[PDB]
């Protein structure tokens, strides 16, 4: 049971690490998507005006 419990705990760490790793990438993507959209559209709006 100890070895089996460690497997579940170790698997939970990998799944938990994936969530933490994905959170860092998600924040970086949202921070970059906002700038790439707010900048590519702001300059285009100025040209049309």
């Amino acid at each position: 049971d100890l070895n089996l419990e460690r497997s579940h705990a170790q698997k939970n760490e990998n799944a938990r690490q994936q969530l933490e790793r994905q959170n860092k990438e998600l924040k970086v993507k949202l921070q970059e998507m906002e700038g790439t959209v707010k900048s590519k559209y702001k300059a285009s709006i100025t040209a049309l005006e």
Binding site: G35, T36, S39, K40, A43, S44, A47
Partner: protein, 49 residues
């Protein structure tokens, strides 16, 4: 990619603005030539008067 994409748009504006500047520069030279011809007619017409 944001600066690269924006850099391409800025470079394209120079090409687009350069096209209009070329026509404006050519029109200025053509209009200036007409002013010289018109000035000669005024002096010739005034002198003949």
């Amino acid at each position: 990619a944001k600066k690269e994409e924006e850099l391409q748009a800025a470079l394209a504006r120079v090409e687009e603005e350069a096209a209009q500047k070329n026509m404006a520069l050519k029109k200025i030279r053509e209009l200036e030539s007409q002013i010289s011809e018109l000035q000669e007619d005024l002096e010739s017409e005034r002198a003949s008067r």
